Design a protein around this ligand. Sequence first.
Ligand SMILES: NCCOCCNC(=O)[C@@H]1CCNC(=O)/C=C/C(=O)N2CCC[C@](Cc3ccccc3)(C2)C(=O)N[C@@H](Cc2ccc(-c3ccc(C#CC(=O)O)cc3)cc2)C(=O)NCc2ccccc2CC(=O)N1
Length: 163
Amino acid sequence: NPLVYLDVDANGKPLGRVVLELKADVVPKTAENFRALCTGEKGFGYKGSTFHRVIPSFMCQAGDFTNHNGTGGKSIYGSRFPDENFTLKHVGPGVLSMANAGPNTNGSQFFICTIKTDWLDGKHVVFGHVIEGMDVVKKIESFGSKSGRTSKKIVITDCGQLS
Ligand SMILES: NCCOCCNC(=O)[C@@H]1CCNC(=O)/C=C/C(=O)N2CCC[C@](Cc3ccccc3)(C2)C(=O)N[C@@H](Cc2ccc(-c3ccc(C#CC(=O)O)cc3)cc2)C(=O)NCc2ccccc2CC(=O)N1
């Protein structure tokens, strides 16, 4: 399974590195989309974009590198792509899952859970997990709010593939 990283800052101050294992063994098309958007190998991707919606005791959401507000994004497949499967469940903090706007509307937006979000099972495609840097995710969460608006600008300063 691929390992990728997000290096995250808040108002320019580094928070540290999140390492994510992508479950290509279960959701290969979804994992590949995220992997490629982390490396930037297609000329676009997550580098420089933000965590735009962060809600404590829920999740941290990112990946809208076109509109920076939860309305945008773009997949590597030329169109919104189908839900690959709903095998993996939102079991707890650190789960990596695809944001969407309903069935078969996967693009680039994603979220990292900070709690078991079981009510999203069967609605959002889970495709990875945090293996290092859950404390960084908790710091991101620390800058969220009930509305999800962040109290600092949370930026993916760098991202890429490790293995
Ligand atoms: N137990 C029930 C109570 O539980 C309490 C906890 N709260 C929850 O469980 C809440 C309760 C319900 N409130 C919300 O849904 C929050 C919504 C929200 O904030 N909007 C702010 C951002 C825009 C909106 C509406 C919208 C506007 C324009 C276009 C689409 C939607 C709304 C929104 O919906 N944008 C989505 C994220 C999204 C993701 C992908 C695309 C997309 C995909 C592909 C391409 C391409 C291509 C190509 O060409 O390749 C382009 C774009 C567009 C939008 C959103 O954010 N989805 C919400 C979400 C996200 C992640 C995880 C979970 C949830 C559910 C949740 O948050 N659920």
